[PDB]
Amino acid sequence: KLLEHKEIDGRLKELREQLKELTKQYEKSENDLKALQSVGQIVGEVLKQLTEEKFIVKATNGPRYVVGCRRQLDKSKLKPGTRVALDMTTLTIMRYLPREVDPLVYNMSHEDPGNVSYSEIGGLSEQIRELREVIELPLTNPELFQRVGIIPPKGCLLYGPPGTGKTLLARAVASQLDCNFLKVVSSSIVDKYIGESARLIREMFNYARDHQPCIIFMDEIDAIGGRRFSEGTSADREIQRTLMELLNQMDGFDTLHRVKMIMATNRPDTLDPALLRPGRLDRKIHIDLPNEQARLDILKIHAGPITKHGEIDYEAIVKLSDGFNGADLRNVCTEAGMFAIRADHDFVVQEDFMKAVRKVADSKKLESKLDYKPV
Amino acid sequence: EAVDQNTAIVGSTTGSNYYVRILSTIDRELLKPNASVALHKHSNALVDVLPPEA
Amino acid sequence: ACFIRVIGSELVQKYVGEGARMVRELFEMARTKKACLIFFDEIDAIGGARFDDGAGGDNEVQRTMLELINQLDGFDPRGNIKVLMATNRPDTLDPALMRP
Amino acid sequence: RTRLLDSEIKIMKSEVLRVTHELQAMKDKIKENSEKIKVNKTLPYLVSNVIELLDVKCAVIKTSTRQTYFLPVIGLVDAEKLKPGDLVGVNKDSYLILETLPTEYDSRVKAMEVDERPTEQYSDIGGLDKQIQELVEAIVLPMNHKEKFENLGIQPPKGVLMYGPPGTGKTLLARACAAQTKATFLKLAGPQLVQMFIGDGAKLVRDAFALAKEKAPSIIFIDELDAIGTKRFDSEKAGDREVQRTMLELLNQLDGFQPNTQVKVIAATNRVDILDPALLRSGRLDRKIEFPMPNEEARARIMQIHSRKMNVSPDVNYEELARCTDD
Amino acid sequence: AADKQTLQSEQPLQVARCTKIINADSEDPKYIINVKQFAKFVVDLSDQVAPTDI
Amino acid sequence: VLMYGPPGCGKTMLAKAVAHHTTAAFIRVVGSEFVQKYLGEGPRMVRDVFRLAKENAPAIIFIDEIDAIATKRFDAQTGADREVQRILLELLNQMDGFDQNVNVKVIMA
């Protein structure tokens, strides 16, 4: 005679699940009913402090006021250039916040997917190690730099033919540090106005001033950097002054603190030789079109998830190919598996690699000017 | 500007312009420029004047 | 005996679908009468190319042009109504009325 | 024989506390959902924008009258569901985030979606037959079976180029794949990307690709890519800028960073030689598919395809007709 | 004063701001209005109208 | 005062050091934020700097920009000509030749 124990325990557990999943959502909605008594607070900024409790302020949508804090708001921490909160009705200061974002920063900052580490890439081991010495070190420890006593360097630029995985290398960086990446495509900065470009640059740079270990990556900088000639196009005046926004605020009065800039271009020639002086960017390091061992190693990276057999003629694929990126190897391996899927090879024959080398090497009829060598 | 004794005209940061009775508290010459002055929320009258700003 | 004349930039009026409302008006005056002729001219500002980026501007033209494709041909075709369209270019038109 | 007595007194207490569970639900929901319907039925509840979102859970609201309102208590959403730079609906009096607006698109993006989807059954394409085969294998099967790729483990393809003479048929694949595959079709022309309005085509590219991100079976038919696809110069005082901004934004938004197989990119140019080396390379457009001039029988075939629904007397020799058509 | 008394009876009968329509949702009326100048709005109707002709 | 030289001679470095040595109220701005939308906006910025300058002291106040906002080409109706005009006229008309007791040595380079 013990079934009533289970016949009450199961009902107690199920009614407890009901009461928990219902009454807890009911307590959250009770907190929402309490939030129905919560007031929207005015955004604004201190203009200047006059007395111990009078504070000259200005609404960002309009008027100007002299008001006071609550009781414990740490008035000393209000310094002109801080973003504060005001009451709606009595208009008294309720809070100060860390500064704004203007969410164009958000929609390219936290859009970033983390990647695999540098195990995906290869044939740039010199670039891996040396660019590691110019990127990774002073946030691991900045004090071997201070054991010798020298200020750490600032930044670099990647160049060569387009698409070799300059940005994929930055992705391998974006998988390594995993800390504070701001990666901007760096051409949409001109909206339709004049100083809004500069203002967004300032907003990102004060975000980099607030947060310590920041990383900056800009791509296709030819649109935004450009070259200074005598003034022709009025739509290049803006690019010259935006470039001077870069010329100051990559050095500034205050030098940056752990704010690394990483750069990657398709042509570094058209950049102004005011930007080619070191200190700002330390060295322009080259990523090349691969060699035999480079093609072989990145190919064997791409030869991984393949239902192959004892047929893989590595040397014919690498030697019958005459300059092909990691993504060109994606093209060749992908379409070799496609030629397998052409007439449905559930396995992978090697002879389709020859067909893919045929197709892509014949497709290279279309691409000239294979270099832009800086300085 | 001031029309007469202790009653004057102030524009505002609310958008429009107003003509206000001002107290004898502020000294009668402290209002030469368009100086930073203090008004009332509800009933719009001068309390104090601050000479610097900006 | 019938004819109506309509310049394109007559529809430059500053409310959304007002030009589309006059497309409604012209197509519901067309079916009242038999063997009639509305005439079209300056059909570039009426719109043939779907120019767009993230602006949201000259869109009454856009929805009016969609209303034009809708009531023009497709969904109870024309009958005893013929309308000529005048231009200097077959270059700035739509491939949806170049629907062959 | 008293464990059942304690458990049945606890079951009467379970009915009591379950009446209390239903009480804390429904009786409190009287107040809550009554006044939350009533706050939803205050107005068309003053749509607005979140500027940022903090967690000291705390949000800043800008109205659609461009007036700002912080709150340290958000309300009827969660901090993860919203994100800053969103359309949001806010009470006029309490200034409270109520509900998210489902209007997060543009205007001529919604006009860009070709809704008619005209019919091209595969009788019509004649002479491009191996192009039909390579085309289906490189585009339609990415829409159907990624199992067919990654059970052999390679990749799905990344764009295909349709080029040849401007008569031999580039419109054919557009209407054919739109009518025969049942994915979400979207097209794109070239002078659309030619704008007097500076600095806005990046919004077109990124917002159309977010549209493709949220309408995942996304055929995107780029047409006349060689309009803005032009091989670059390095001159002085000669040339515009924003065409290169839109072109390079399409490039850096397609390749370089953030890849996605929720996009399918179909471009079709007449000529190829004007195009950049960066517009193709091997992840921009994977394939380089030239089109044959219709040899003899392809001319006869398509000429009969146009004469399918017309009255044709059988005294017609198509090989004679198409064979005395040269070029 | 040819209708002055009825004009002293239309003072409790006054409604209907101008408010051009942008668009709507689906499955329901649920329209969307800008007034003129202020803002935008996602509106719903009073009950004694025709949801067809909106 | 006016400076020139190739990029990389430590151009801001002198301004850094002279800001360090001095006692005065080293108000700094930079140049490329002067190009802004509303009427006389950057001109209002220059007058804010000058009125606050004459309010503080003739102590030392600082600006560091010359290039491409104030070129000698007055004569072009080619874009932002309201802004180009107000910047050029503001620079000259607040230069004035002199103000004689304010804003010691705007250094341009």
Ligand SMILES: Nc1ncnc2c1ncn2[C@@H]1O[C@H](COP(=O)(O)OP(=O)(O)OP(O)(O)=S)[C@@H](O)[C@H]1O
């Ligand atoms: N199978 C076909 N059916 C109908 N028209 C065809 C066919 N093949 C070719 N054409 C004609 O070929 C011409 C051009 O075809 P398309 O190349 O698709 O036009 P398009 O859209 O201008 O392509 P572009 O200019 O290269 S981006 C038109 O006059 C078409 O009618």
Ligand SMILES: Nc1ncnc2c1ncn2[C@@H]1O[C@H](COP(=O)(O)OP(=O)(O)OP(O)(O)=S)[C@@H](O)[C@H]1O
């Ligand atoms: N002569 C120098 N010797 C050593 N380091 C120097 C020297 N000049 C500048 N620096 C370094 O660069 C910083 C200051 O350089 P800047 O004065 O900003 O040059 P610059 O102003 O950026 O050049 P411009 O303005 O683009 S022409 C110092 O903090 C040092 O780190």
